Amino acid sequence: RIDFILVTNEKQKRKRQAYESNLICLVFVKVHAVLCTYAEIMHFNPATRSRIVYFILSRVKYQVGINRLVSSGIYKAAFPLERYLLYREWAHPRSIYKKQPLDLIRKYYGEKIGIYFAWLGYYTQMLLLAAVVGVACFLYGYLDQDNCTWSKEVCDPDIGGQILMCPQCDRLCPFWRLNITCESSKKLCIFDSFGTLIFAVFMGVWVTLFLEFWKRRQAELEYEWDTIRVTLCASAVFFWILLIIASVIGIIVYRLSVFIVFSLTPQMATSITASIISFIIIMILNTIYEKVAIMITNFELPRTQTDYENSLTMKMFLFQFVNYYSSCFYIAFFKGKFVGYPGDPVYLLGKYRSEECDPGGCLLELTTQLTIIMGGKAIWNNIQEVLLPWVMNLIGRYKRVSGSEKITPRWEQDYHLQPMGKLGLFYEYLEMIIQFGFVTLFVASFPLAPLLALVNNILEIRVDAWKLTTQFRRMVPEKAQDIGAWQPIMQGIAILAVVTNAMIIAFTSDMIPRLVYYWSFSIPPYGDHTYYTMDGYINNTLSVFNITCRYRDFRNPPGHPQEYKHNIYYWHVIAAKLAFIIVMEHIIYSVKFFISYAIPDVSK
Amino acid sequence: RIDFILVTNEKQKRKRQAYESNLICLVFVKVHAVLCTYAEIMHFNPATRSRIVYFILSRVKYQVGINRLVSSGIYKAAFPLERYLLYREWAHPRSIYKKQPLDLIRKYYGEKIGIYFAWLGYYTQMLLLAAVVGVACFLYGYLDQDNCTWSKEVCDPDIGGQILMCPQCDRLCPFWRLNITCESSKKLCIFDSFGTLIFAVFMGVWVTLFLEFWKRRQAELEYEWDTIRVTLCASAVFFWILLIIASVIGIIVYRLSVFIVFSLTPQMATSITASIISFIIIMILNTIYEKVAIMITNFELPRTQTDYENSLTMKMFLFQFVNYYSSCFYIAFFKGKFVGYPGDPVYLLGKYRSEECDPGGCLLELTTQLTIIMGGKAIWNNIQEVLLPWVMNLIGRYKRVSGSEKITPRWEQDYHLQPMGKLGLFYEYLEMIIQFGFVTLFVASFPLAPLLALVNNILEIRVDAWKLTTQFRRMVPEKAQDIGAWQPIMQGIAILAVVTNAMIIAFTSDMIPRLVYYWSFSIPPYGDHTYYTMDGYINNTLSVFNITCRYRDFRNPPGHPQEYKHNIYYWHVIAAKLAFIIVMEHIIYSVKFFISYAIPDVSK
Ligand SMILES: [Ca+2]
Ligand SMILES: [Ca+2]
């Protein structure tokens, strides 16, 4: 029974006939394994039966491997050929919610694809406790939003009506009031109130437990399963940061476009629309960033893709890092900053002015860009994988695909299946490490981003199950362990996540400015109250600006001793911002030190 | 030739005679190795000749090892028996400065003691580049101290003479002027000026390079050489923090003693004297902390000392951490804080007041406590090791000790030598990890603390060479690698050092308050000058206090809007303190990420 099938005319022909000769123990050439004699050199099962015959295909070149032989063009394809159950209890409609038979991914696909499919299946249950603490925040961020006087002053037009602010832009830009920030700041109080600073502190607890409990999990998965130089790297990173700023400026021009033609408030309709339009070009500029990441690595020194696990990963992911997240690193740490003396922008070192944010925290503009990137990439990378097959279950496959595991010699049909690609699950880990660096990078806001990534991870655990089972020409059942190049990147994201979640709460969410006013401006030092009460916070926080209106900034009022230089309060909150950065990092980095000390990695 | 020598009466006698029987292939019993037959079970040289016969002594107990046999009392001692050169070119006066033959510590003592003696020898050259950048600071902290107007106002009695401060203590405590802080603040400007915030940033660069270049070094050393549970651990840490605060209060009462009987200013003579008196009791309370660390581990569960490498290390070092450093963690983060409304102390939750620091930064009280702890422990732990032998080279040893390597059967003389102790180089790594967590914990101040620890590490590299060669009964040449339990502790000190050096500069050194005044109070916002100049900083920084005098604090003057609550400036500097914590950690933790990425660990 079959294990692997292969498929200037006479000049390449003599290059081909000599390799098949010592392999011996259109028309497609069968193999079958002499089977034992290469099973002792490396340390039955049809998934293993394709392994050893690929190990046979590894050593013997020619006299004058299919690495350069298929890349030259002599061969057109070389490919291989339990499956019935993986369409029923693990694939689609006949049943879709049943626990994943991960040891029956060893049975078919091994651990190249299993260590993604248990890292996905662990991720989903680890997103389950992370989504109820999104629903918990959705409970007391919305249902508790009837008294909290953050999003009650802003929607009462008596506390939030007469608050006449300044324009942001220069021309065609109004003196816009408050009471136009209510439909955004009635749902803003579910994203920030108290159970996000519980939740992001929980997320920092979560991601540093998501790691370590997976570190115990993959150890259990390791248990149940087997076991000129500084000049060349310079001009690869140096053209890169020149192309980072293209991606940072990609959103902003498409921020310069849609905001003109426009003007369920239109402000939510626009922030959806620009995060659709920027989602178009980040879908486009993703294609270029794969092609300019290949041509920099082949212009880099020789190693087959096998070294691109260390080099294309650190370039193509890190392009995707810049392509996806450095737009969101704009709406978060660089958008809302740099207003000055006459509302002085930094003018962005050119002839135009720079742009500002709104007085609710600029987190809502993030949290919809966060939503419909990670929930648009969830759609678009699970609609692209039902459009490649150009149908969803055309043929019946009721008694036929049982037979395709029975015997059913069909390799003319398996030639029609698309090849897996030269890089395997590199493109599939990429769209999840992109998702994982969305659930943990910008999560203070939108705590249901686990739930959105939960029902995604009930489908993506099943749609990637389905296209591996039905659609793709079968990948070689390679045995790897420790998923590899992403685990320093996940920890590289997670240590960056403890910084950036804390920088989300401090520098792009006005909850520390709320925390402080509760504790240090409604006490009678600088305040007018008896005990702690959040009454009167929206007038009590911002800076007036004489016509020589308020703007989202902590600055001395004009007509005071040192005006448009900061306050005690810009100084206190930025000192409490920087303390919250300092405290919550030194606690989460201690709990990361404690929890990894509290439980050993190897299985109990 | 000899490899290892051993040495109710009849009741213990029958327990003894049966072990020697199958070992066969006062009066001291020789051994010599049947030598080959245990050299294949584990994977010539007299240093190895004592290894394999100790490996022979490992398996065969008795029928009814010297672990429990010498601990019971049947045996009185069991011990073992190239050496001429290690007294000449590596030991003392005949020659003392010659490069250490570290591979000739493999020749005699192996890698139990060699991996300390190359970790010391690397440490010394890595303290050499760290001491010139102490001399560089000693150049432009002293020789540049003629204009800097920090320590020129304080010694000019015209800028620092009329500055009439407040008392610190309550009774017998004066209204003390300035011009009594000049002899301390003429040498204060060598400890803090610019080339300490270069140097501590250099130290944070240094310790994160001291690690990684040793990580490359020990890899080269690995290359050239071989290859109820939560309830029991609770009440060990819970009685401990009750004994931490004894060590914190150990200094303060001996701060309450000497400061009464007293009152080259007497203030330098007192800070030497109390850091002599606290050095007495920390020498005393060290003895208790060894005895209460043993009796907690034998009251903990059974493992011979072999598990005490993981448990006595994490208790006895961590006692020494608390015994030595938590006095210096008092003079640094908890001494100079908590002054309040009528100069309100926190009263230390009792019937007495609390105590304050001086207006130069409280770093000088640290830097002499830092000096004469680490330079008194350098004396006392290298005078205790010339007093145990009760002489230094009594006998001639010119042609005799050459003969002790020639043959010279002398085991009656080697019985007189003191035993090495049950724990080996645990007490010798301890006094250096104590020194290493002095060079890197509290180093912003005293940049010659590498040079003090350099000439120490020319003697300690030689006095520990000498007592290993002449004095001690020879340790068993055990082969270990990665020095072990201290390498997570060194990295545990070093990641704590990046925090605490930055917390030295910010929270216990007024250089950030100098940095800020240079940049943000002598510009005309809040200032009265044309360009940046450090003129007028000592009046311009502190808080007046109506009789209702200045004190080292950033507070609103009485008779202002919200008095004795902080300023823009307490708010700016503490925001720039916390930023300097944030920036220099995120740069040093990035350079730690960059340098460990820049160079691979395994040898080139
Ligand atoms: Ca997929
Ligand atoms: Ca010593």
Side-chain angles (χ1 to χ4, degrees), chain A residues 1-15 17-604, chain B residues 1-15 17-604:
Chain A
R1 49 170 291 157
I2 183 56
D3 276 332
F4 204 99
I5 315 202
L6 65 88
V7 60
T8 2
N9 206 321
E10 82 292 332
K11 166 75 199 69
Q12 299 321 299
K13 174 63 191 296
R14 53 181 297 267
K15 208 183 288 175
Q17 58 90 31
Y19 163 68
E20 190 178 354
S21 43
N22 50 3
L23 206 156
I24 314 300
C25 290
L26 300 169
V27 176
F28 308 100
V29 176
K30 291 182 53 173
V31 313
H32 163 261
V34 185
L35 63 100
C36 296
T37 74
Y38 289 88
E40 316 89 342
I41 181 170
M42 213 49 195
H43 207 302
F44 212 47
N45 187 338
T48 68
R49 258 170 38 86
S50 177
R51 290 199 292 129
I52 55 175
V53 188
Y54 193 81
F55 193 58
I56 290 192
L57 167 152
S58 316
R59 174 64 180 84
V60 46
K61 315 288 144 42
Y62 57 91
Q63 45 184 1
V64 61
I66 50 179
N67 297 112
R68 212 177 42 182
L69 170 70
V70 307
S71 284
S72 43
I74 273 85
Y75 277 2
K76 261 59 172 161
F79 59 94
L81 273 71
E82 52 185 8
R83 183 259 173 275
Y84 179 67
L85 171 143
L86 298 169
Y87 191 43
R88 292 286 173 269
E89 270 86 10
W90 186 61
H92 244 41
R94 303 283 79 79
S95 174
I96 303 180
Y97 60 90
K98 302 301 179 181
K99 202 179 286 185
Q100 324 160 25
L102 298 169
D103 244 80
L104 286 82
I105 307 310
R106 185 170 198 81
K107 291 220 325 167
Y108 215 60
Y109 292 119
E111 312 320 309
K112 175 66 74 61
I113 297 100
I115 208 59
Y116 161 96
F117 265 116
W119 179 79
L120 203 53
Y122 162 73
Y123 195 40
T124 318
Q125 46 196 119
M126 207 40 60
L127 282 153
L128 192 47
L129 54 95
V132 282
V133 188
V135 174
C137 178
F138 194 91
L139 187 68
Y140 66 98
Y142 192 54
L143 271 296
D144 185 53
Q145 196 251 329
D146 47 353
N147 51 3
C148 43
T149 345
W150 158 214
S151 279
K152 305 299 294 182
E153 286 172 19
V154 195
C155 273
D156 290 27
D158 309 73
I159 299 63
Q162 309 95 4
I163 318 297
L164 273 77
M165 267 69 67
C166 321
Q168 297 175 354
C169 39
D170 284 340
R171 300 314 215 278
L172 183 94
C173 209
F175 202 64
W176 61 288
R177 206 175 82 175
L178 209 50
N179 196 15
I180 65 178
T181 322
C182 168
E183 312 94 20
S184 86
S185 324
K186 194 89 172 179
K187 71 174 299 189
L188 186 44
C189 203
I190 87 167
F191 294 133
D192 57 16
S193 288
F194 267 122
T196 71
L197 270 70
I198 278 186
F199 176 68
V201 162
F202 177 70
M203 274 286 106
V205 161
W206 177 76
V207 61
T208 49
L209 173 51
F210 161 74
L211 280 178
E212 203 282 336
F213 206 88
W214 191 66
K215 297 310 275 303
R216 187 184 164 189
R217 175 65 185 265
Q218 66 94 26
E220 207 279 339
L221 292 184
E222 203 168 3
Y223 188 73
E224 275 302 284
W225 298 325
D226 187 272
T227 314
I228 70 167
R229 326 289 170 79
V230 300
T231 82
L232 59 90
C233 203
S235 172
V237 190
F238 286 176
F239 266 58
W240 163 290
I241 303 152
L242 206 165
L243 263 297
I244 296 180
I245 68 164
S247 58
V248 167
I249 201 175
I251 171 174
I252 307 169
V253 192
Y254 275 158
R255 189 244 182 212
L256 195 137
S257 88
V258 56
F259 273 93
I260 283 176
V261 310
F262 269 28
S263 42
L264 299 57
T265 60
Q267 190 53 40
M268 324 204 316
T270 302
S271 202
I272 294 220
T273 307
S275 299
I276 285 302
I277 296 296
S278 177
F279 190 55
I280 297 309
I281 165 170
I282 294 316
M283 269 312 146
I284 278 154
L285 172 57
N286 185 21
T287 79
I288 299 189
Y289 284 162
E290 305 157 279
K291 266 56 155 156
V292 308
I294 286 288
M295 81 175 67
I296 193 59
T297 50
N298 288 334
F299 282 174
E300 201 280 330
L301 193 144
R303 304 178 184 270
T304 55
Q305 290 263 98
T306 59
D307 191 89
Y308 289 0
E309 185 260 12
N310 266 12
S311 56
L312 194 61
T313 285
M314 207 38 76
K315 289 286 152 194
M316 198 181 292
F317 151 75
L318 202 63
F319 265 124
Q320 293 327 293
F321 193 95
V322 155
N323 206 34
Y324 285 97
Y325 304 158
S326 203
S327 172
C328 303
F329 281 153
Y330 192 73
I331 316 151
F333 319 116
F334 209 71
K335 190 160 150 290
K337 319 297 161 177
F338 309 104
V339 206
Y341 326 142
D344 191 23
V346 288
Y347 226 55
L348 327 127
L349 246 340
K351 321 72 44 197
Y352 303 152
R353 82 281 181 272
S354 161
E355 53 88 17
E356 280 76 66
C357 275
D358 283 332
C362 203
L363 186 64
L364 203 74
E365 188 77 23
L366 171 67
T367 198
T368 64
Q369 179 104 19
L370 196 69
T371 286
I372 80 166
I373 285 182
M374 77 172 288
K377 191 180 176 65
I379 288 307
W380 174 253
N381 291 346
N382 287 324
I383 288 302
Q384 198 178 12
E385 272 79 2
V386 306
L387 282 205
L388 55 62
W390 309 287
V391 282
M392 210 220 102
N393 59 280
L394 200 167
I395 57 170
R397 303 174 90 89
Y398 180 53
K399 299 314 214 185
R400 191 222 78 80
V401 288
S402 176
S404 59
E405 198 51 41
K406 294 334 156 175
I407 173 64
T408 314
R410 79 280 199 182
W411 60 87
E412 63 267 13
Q413 312 221 302
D414 299 351
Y415 199 64
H416 308 153
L417 309 187
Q418 276 74 13
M420 71 158 195
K422 309 193 241 186
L423 48 89
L425 290 199
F426 172 78
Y427 276 176
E428 276 73 25
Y429 273 145
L430 189 61
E431 72 187 6
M432 295 294 318
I433 292 308
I434 287 305
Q435 153 167 337
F436 172 65
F438 275 135
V439 186
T440 44
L441 253 63
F442 312 95
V443 91
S445 79
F446 193 36
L448 281 302
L451 189 64
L452 152 72
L454 186 123
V455 295
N456 187 25
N457 289 174
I458 296 306
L459 271 292
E460 198 141 338
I461 190 76
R462 271 70 157 90
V463 61
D464 287 4
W466 163 89
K467 63 182 267 221
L468 260 295
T469 304
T470 49
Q471 267 61 238
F472 271 173
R473 193 177 295 169
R474 176 173 181 172
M475 314 206 172
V476 186
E478 199 289 321
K479 184 162 300 296
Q481 64 180 20
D482 300 2
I483 76 167
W486 316 101
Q487 216 165 305
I489 278 174
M490 256 166 51
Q491 273 141 9
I493 269 172
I495 308 300
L496 193 72
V498 181
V499 168
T500 194
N501 280 115
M503 288 259 182
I504 281 295
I505 299 152
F507 287 91
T508 171
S509 151
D510 277 332
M511 291 304 110
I512 315 293
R514 68 164 273 164
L515 257 188
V516 160
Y517 163 73
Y518 195 44
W519 289 132
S520 306
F521 272 180
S522 178
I523 76 154
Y526 304 114
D528 296 328
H529 214 267
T530 166
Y531 48 81
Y532 323 100
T533 306
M534 286 287 308
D535 279 353
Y537 161 74
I538 290 302
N539 189 13
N540 303 0
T541 286
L542 265 59
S543 162
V544 202
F545 176 89
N546 216 351
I547 313 297
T548 78
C549 65
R550 304 180 179 82
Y551 49 75
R552 193 258 320 136
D553 215 17
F554 312 141
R555 253 164 171 99
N556 266 280
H560 222 68
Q562 279 81 12
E563 56 194 34
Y564 300 129
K565 273 88 172 190
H566 304 265
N567 307 123
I568 47 137
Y569 167 60
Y570 179 89
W571 288 127
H572 194 174
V573 162
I574 200 162
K577 279 191 202 147
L578 293 178
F580 196 91
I581 309 285
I582 273 166
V583 164
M584 285 313 129
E585 280 155 356
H586 294 129
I587 279 177
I588 297 303
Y589 293 137
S590 71
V591 162
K592 186 253 286 184
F593 164 71
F594 284 170
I595 291 289
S596 84
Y597 192 88
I599 187 66
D601 280 18
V602 291
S603 288
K604 283 18 109 241
Chain B
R1 49 170 291 157
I2 183 56
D3 276 332
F4 204 99
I5 315 202
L6 65 88
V7 60
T8 2
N9 206 321
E10 82 292 332
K11 166 75 199 69
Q12 299 321 299
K13 174 63 191 296
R14 53 181 297 267
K15 208 183 288 175
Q17 58 90 31
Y19 163 68
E20 190 178 354
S21 43
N22 50 3
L23 206 156
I24 314 300
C25 290
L26 300 169
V27 176
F28 308 100
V29 176
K30 291 182 53 173
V31 313
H32 163 261
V34 185
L35 63 100
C36 296
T37 74
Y38 289 88
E40 316 89 342
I41 181 170
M42 213 49 195
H43 207 302
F44 212 47
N45 187 338
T48 68
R49 258 170 38 86
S50 177
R51 290 199 292 129
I52 55 175
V53 188
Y54 193 81
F55 193 58
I56 290 192
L57 167 152
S58 316
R59 174 64 180 84
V60 46
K61 315 288 144 42
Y62 57 91
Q63 45 184 1
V64 61
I66 50 179
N67 297 112
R68 212 177 42 182
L69 170 70
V70 307
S71 284
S72 43
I74 273 85
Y75 277 2
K76 261 59 172 161
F79 59 94
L81 273 71
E82 52 185 8
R83 183 259 173 275
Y84 179 67
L85 171 144
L86 298 169
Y87 191 43
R88 292 286 173 269
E89 270 86 11
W90 186 61
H92 244 41
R94 303 283 79 78
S95 174
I96 303 180
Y97 60 90
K98 302 301 179 181
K99 202 179 286 185
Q100 324 160 25
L102 298 169
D103 244 80
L104 286 82
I105 307 310
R106 185 170 198 81
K107 291 220 325 167
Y108 215 60
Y109 292 119
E111 312 320 309
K112 175 66 74 61
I113 297 100
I115 208 59
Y116 161 96
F117 265 116
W119 179 79
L120 204 53
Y122 163 73
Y123 195 40
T124 318
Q125 46 196 119
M126 207 40 60
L127 282 153
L128 192 47
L129 54 95
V132 282
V133 188
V135 174
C137 178
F138 194 91
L139 187 68
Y140 66 98
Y142 192 54
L143 271 296
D144 185 53
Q145 196 251 329
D146 47 353
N147 51 3
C148 43
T149 345
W150 158 214
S151 279
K152 305 299 294 182
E153 286 173 19
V154 195
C155 273
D156 290 27
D158 309 73
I159 299 63
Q162 309 95 4
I163 318 297
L164 273 77
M165 268 69 67
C166 321
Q168 297 175 354
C169 39
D170 284 340
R171 300 314 215 278
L172 183 94
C173 209
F175 202 64
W176 61 288
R177 207 175 82 175
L178 209 50
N179 196 15
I180 65 178
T181 322
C182 168
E183 312 94 20
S184 87
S185 324
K186 194 88 172 179
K187 71 174 299 189
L188 186 44
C189 203
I190 87 167
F191 293 133
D192 57 16
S193 288
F194 267 122
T196 71
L197 270 70
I198 278 186
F199 176 68
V201 163
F202 177 70
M203 274 286 106
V205 161
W206 177 76
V207 61
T208 49
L209 173 52
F210 161 74
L211 280 178
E212 203 282 336
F213 206 88
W214 191 66
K215 297 310 275 303
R216 187 184 164 189
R217 175 65 185 265
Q218 66 94 26
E220 207 279 339
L221 292 184
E222 203 168 3
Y223 188 73
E224 275 302 284
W225 298 325
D226 187 272
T227 314
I228 70 167
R229 326 289 170 79
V230 300
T231 82
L232 59 90
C233 203
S235 172
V237 190
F238 286 176
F239 266 58
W240 163 290
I241 303 152
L242 206 165
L243 263 297
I244 296 180
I245 68 164
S247 58
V248 167
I249 201 175
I251 172 174
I252 307 169
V253 192
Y254 275 158
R255 189 244 182 212
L256 195 138
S257 88
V258 56
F259 274 93
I260 283 176
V261 310
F262 269 28
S263 42
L264 299 57
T265 60
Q267 190 53 40
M268 324 204 316
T270 302
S271 202
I272 294 220
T273 307
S275 299
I276 285 302
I277 296 296
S278 177
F279 190 55
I280 297 309
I281 165 170
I282 294 316
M283 269 312 146
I284 278 154
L285 172 57
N286 185 21
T287 79
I288 299 189
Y289 284 162
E290 305 157 279
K291 266 56 155 156
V292 308
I294 286 288
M295 81 175 67
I296 193 59
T297 50
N298 288 334
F299 282 174
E300 201 280 330
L301 193 144
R303 304 178 184 270
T304 55
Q305 290 263 98
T306 59
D307 191 89
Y308 289 0
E309 185 260 12
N310 266 12
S311 56
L312 194 61
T313 285
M314 207 38 76
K315 289 286 152 194
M316 198 181 292
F317 151 75
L318 201 63
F319 265 124
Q320 293 327 293
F321 193 95
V322 155
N323 207 34
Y324 285 97
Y325 304 158
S326 203
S327 172
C328 303
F329 281 153
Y330 192 73
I331 316 151
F333 319 116
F334 209 71
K335 190 160 150 290
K337 319 297 161 177
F338 309 104
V339 206
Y341 326 142
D344 191 23
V346 288
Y347 226 55
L348 327 127
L349 246 340
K351 321 72 44 197
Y352 303 152
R353 82 281 181 272
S354 161
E355 53 88 17
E356 280 76 66
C357 275
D358 283 332
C362 203
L363 186 64
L364 203 74
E365 188 77 23
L366 171 67
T367 198
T368 64
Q369 179 104 19
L370 196 69
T371 286
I372 80 166
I373 285 182
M374 77 172 288
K377 191 180 176 65
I379 288 307
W380 174 253
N381 291 346
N382 287 324
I383 288 302
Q384 198 178 12
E385 272 79 2
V386 306
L387 282 205
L388 55 62
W390 309 287
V391 282
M392 210 220 102
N393 59 280
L394 200 167
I395 57 170
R397 303 174 90 89
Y398 180 53
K399 299 314 214 185
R400 191 222 78 80
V401 288
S402 176
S404 59
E405 198 51 41
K406 294 334 156 175
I407 173 64
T408 314
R410 79 280 199 182
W411 60 87
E412 63 267 13
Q413 312 221 302
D414 299 351
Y415 199 64
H416 308 153
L417 309 187
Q418 276 74 13
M420 71 158 195
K422 309 193 241 186
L423 48 89
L425 290 199
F426 172 78
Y427 276 176
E428 276 73 25
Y429 273 145
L430 189 61
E431 72 187 6
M432 295 294 318
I433 292 308
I434 287 305
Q435 153 167 337
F436 172 64
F438 275 135
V439 186
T440 44
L441 253 63
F442 312 95
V443 91
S445 79
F446 193 36
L448 281 302
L451 189 64
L452 152 72
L454 186 123
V455 295
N456 187 25
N457 289 174
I458 296 306
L459 271 292
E460 198 141 338
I461 191 76
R462 271 70 157 90
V463 61
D464 287 4
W466 163 89
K467 63 182 267 221
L468 260 295
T469 304
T470 49
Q471 267 61 238
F472 271 173
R473 193 177 295 170
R474 176 173 181 171
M475 314 206 172
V476 186
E478 199 289 321
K479 184 162 300 296
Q481 64 180 20
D482 300 2
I483 76 167
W486 316 101
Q487 216 165 305
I489 278 174
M490 256 166 51
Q491 273 141 9
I493 269 172
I495 308 300
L496 193 72
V498 181
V499 168
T500 194
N501 280 115
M503 288 259 182
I504 281 295
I505 299 152
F507 287 91
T508 171
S509 151
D510 277 332
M511 291 304 110
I512 315 293
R514 68 164 273 164
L515 257 188
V516 160
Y517 163 73
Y518 195 44
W519 289 132
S520 306
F521 272 180
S522 178
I523 76 154
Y526 304 114
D528 296 328
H529 214 267
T530 166
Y531 48 81
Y532 323 100
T533 306
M534 286 287 308
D535 279 353
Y537 161 74
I538 290 302
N539 189 13
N540 302 0
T541 286
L542 265 59
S543 162
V544 202
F545 176 89
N546 216 351
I547 313 297
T548 78
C549 65
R550 304 180 179 82
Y551 49 75
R552 193 258 320 136
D553 215 17
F554 312 141
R555 253 164 171 99
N556 266 280
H560 222 69
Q562 279 81 12
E563 56 194 34
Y564 300 129
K565 273 88 172 190
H566 304 265
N567 307 123
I568 47 137
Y569 167 60
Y570 179 89
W571 288 127
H572 194 174
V573 162
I574 200 162
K577 279 191 202 147
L578 293 178
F580 196 91
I581 309 285
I582 273 166
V583 164
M584 285 313 129
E585 280 155 356
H586 294 129
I587 279 177
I588 297 303
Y589 293 137
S590 71
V591 162
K592 186 253 286 184
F593 164 71
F594 284 170
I595 291 289
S596 84
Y597 192 88
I599 187 66
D601 280 18
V602 291
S603 288
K604 283 18 109 241

